[PDB]
Ligand binder design. Sequence first.
Ligand SMILES: *C(=O)[C@@H]([C@@H]1NC(C(=O)O)=C(S[C@@H]2CN[C@H](C(=O)N(C)C)C2)[C@@H]1C)[C@@H](C)O
Length: 498
Amino acid sequence: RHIAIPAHRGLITDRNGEPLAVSTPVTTLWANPKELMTAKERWPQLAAALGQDTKLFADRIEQNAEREFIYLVRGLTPEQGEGVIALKVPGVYSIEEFRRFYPAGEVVAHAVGFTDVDDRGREGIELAFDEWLAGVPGKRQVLKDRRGRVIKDVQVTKNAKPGKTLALSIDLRLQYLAHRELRNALLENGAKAGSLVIMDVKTGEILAMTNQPTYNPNNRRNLQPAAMRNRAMIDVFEPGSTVKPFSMSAALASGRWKPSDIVDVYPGTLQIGRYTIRDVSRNSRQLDLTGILIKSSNVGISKIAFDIGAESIYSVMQQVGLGQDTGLGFPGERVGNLPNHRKWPKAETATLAYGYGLSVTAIQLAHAYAALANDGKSVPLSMTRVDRVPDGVQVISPEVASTVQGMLQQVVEAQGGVFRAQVPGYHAAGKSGTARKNAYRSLFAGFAPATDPRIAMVVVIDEPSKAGYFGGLVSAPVFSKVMAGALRLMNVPPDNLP
Ligand SMILES: *C(=O)[C@@H]([C@@H]1NC(C(=O)O)=C(S[C@@H]2CN[C@H](C(=O)N(C)C)C2)[C@@H]1C)[C@@H](C)O
């Protein structure tokens, strides 16, 4: 009785108007088997025109002989569709439909996602913003005799309303740079999987989100399953040392600690009841707060955690969004877990403090660094272009955030620091770490320009079979290269000036 009139699906562009998902006209062929059944001699030419086996085609028509609508083929070009319609096969009609094509392809596959056969969002932005993008389908009334001769297509019951254009937060230029550099780093280190997230610290915008391995959304016939995984939003891990700047934020906000305060960590181990906290680097006695970060001392961070209490640490981590909902409403996005133990024994206090007491995603870690870089102000995450920036929330006092930024600038720039993360022409800040899932990931989280932050970035490189990945060796060089390129693409003035 009714045949739907598909609506033009809204265009998806990057933030600069570059096309990412385009509704393109296609011609679909359908048939009324009751009418096709009267023209059996035409079937082989029809089957041959559709590149279909004559018998498989005949069986399909015979098996559907009492039906009034079946699809023959979907998604042909207008010219191909016209050519078959030009054979004048009785009971064979055409529907002008729309099919999504993804011009940037594998470069932004997970972020954009894709639609199903019926042009409905199935993954990523296509799904998250399906109501905005879809539009309203039309309706046409088909009236036939008491069998299969089309008596009336009388009218169109309702016209189609097209979907709405959507500009993503993604900057395809930064996305391409991140994609290329993550693939390069994976090949260099013998790694197979990873993610790279770039964020605008002032606006909450996700400027880049790339996952390796990736896939071509235009050709989804039996791909590798690992390729489909949106790692940045789905791979949950214990962030480890990358959350020590948050434990430091709690220490500075407690009123008990100043950056020049000292902690004795010798001999790089600390016994707490039956348990032993151990530092990987064990060449220290007295360290200031910046030194605890540079040497990544678990003993140093744990002693501070015992002094200030785990409640203060848990609260900073919860306030910056670690193990919390992002509010993006992105399909398949995971939350992780930040356990609120209410009362923490010494062992749980220490493990929380050096980041093995919680599980987060790369997106949550990048959002947490954005808050720190944005002078302690958290702006809601956005996968769409943000024109009017929300007020956000002051989650870390501006004083504490500015102090920790300076400590992280020293982690990158000071003697003995993560020098492979330095960005020529700029001052940069960040912290390397080894994530845990035991499966490991090499991490670098940071932001730049260090003295007036604009961009936050997280690099996650998955550690294969055997260890040996140090975040400072593996992920830090990727941060340097992508950050150098992203700041220049954004015309951010160099801050490393005399
Ligand atoms: C945190 O993730 C763990 C520590 N964090 C780091 C780090 O700084 O990435 C280290 S590695 C330690 C510090 N610098 C040395 C280094 O980078 N190499 C010699 C290459 C060794 C620890 C793994 C923490 C939870 O133990």
